[PDB]
Amino acid sequence: EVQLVESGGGLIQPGGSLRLSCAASGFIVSRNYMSWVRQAPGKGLEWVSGIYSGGSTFYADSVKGRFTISRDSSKNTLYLQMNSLRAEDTAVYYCAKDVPLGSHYFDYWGQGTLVTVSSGEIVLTQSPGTLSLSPGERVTLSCRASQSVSINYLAWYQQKPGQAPRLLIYGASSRATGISDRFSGSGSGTDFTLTISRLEPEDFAVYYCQQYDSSPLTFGGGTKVEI
């Protein structure tokens, strides 16, 4: 069905420039909402830039004026032009297909491409930071928000080692398609929980919450679950 495949990236000199591209299948790029999200070791998951179905573009404050999101209708490709690159831009970059509710969440992700540069928001606090449990055990992860997420616009992702995040929960309690029924979201207001009822070895991953109540969208810091 839907496929997102990045190309471009690599090692660049500070102040250099670089263009990422994202070839999509399964939908017309120039007719849908799409985004770039990056993962840096220090700042975690961070929204970078979005384009609307009608062409309006939006940028995180850290990249405004340096980055340009665009698309080519003829090639069904999304682009991210990065100029004046800084060390702090070092990150794995994902293109992502928006679900355009609130400030948006992402039901499809690209594979992730590494860029290395040489030389008012709602804050989500995740607890605890790392867990180590045995198969068959129950685990509950907390997501606390700095402000009330009033209509449950809170999503949960699972990121297995070396992979892109995968949406598990949206709307605080609704499971995404194909997600196993032992993943359970709940909570309201400022306190949200993800419960994994019988841990399996494959559940080894970092779990991120993401609020799409307010702009910019923001992610929690992640809780690693080790099995």
Add this chain to the structure above:
Amino acid sequence: LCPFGEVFNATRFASVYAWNRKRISNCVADYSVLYNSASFSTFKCYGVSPTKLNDLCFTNVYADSFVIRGDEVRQIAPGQTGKIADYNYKLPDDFTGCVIAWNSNNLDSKVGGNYNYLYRLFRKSNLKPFERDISTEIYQAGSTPCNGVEGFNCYFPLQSYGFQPTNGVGYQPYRVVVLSFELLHAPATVCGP
């Protein structure tokens, strides 16, 4: 006396995608009275001011009105972008007039949710200033024609606000009235005191 009561004090407001326009003409208006007439969370004027509007007759005075949610009121301003400015109601870059808004959670929310107010979510291009798009054709997001059927890559183009009284302010309903003013070499029949 200008029929601003009909606009501001209407019992029901339009959905933003089908925003209402009332032409004002051949009447006297007191915009200073209008300003102090209620508690308005937003009352921003561009190129004019209430005090100065009382001093002049204008040619084309329009009152546009609709409901959006709290976090979107900022889009009813010149030069803005977002789903509301792009696909529902677009002010011109150099608008002459006033944007007036107030919180209407007490009127427009319901226990169990008001899903009567709609906004356009999908559109292939942006509105021109003061343009209205009231079509409800299925939005074709993929290469396959939809032919009137909702489904995959085939979206009903509008979405509902779900106005519940316990929503945060950013998701509470706001009633909006946009007053437009032009002075032309044409008859000017909306006058002040």
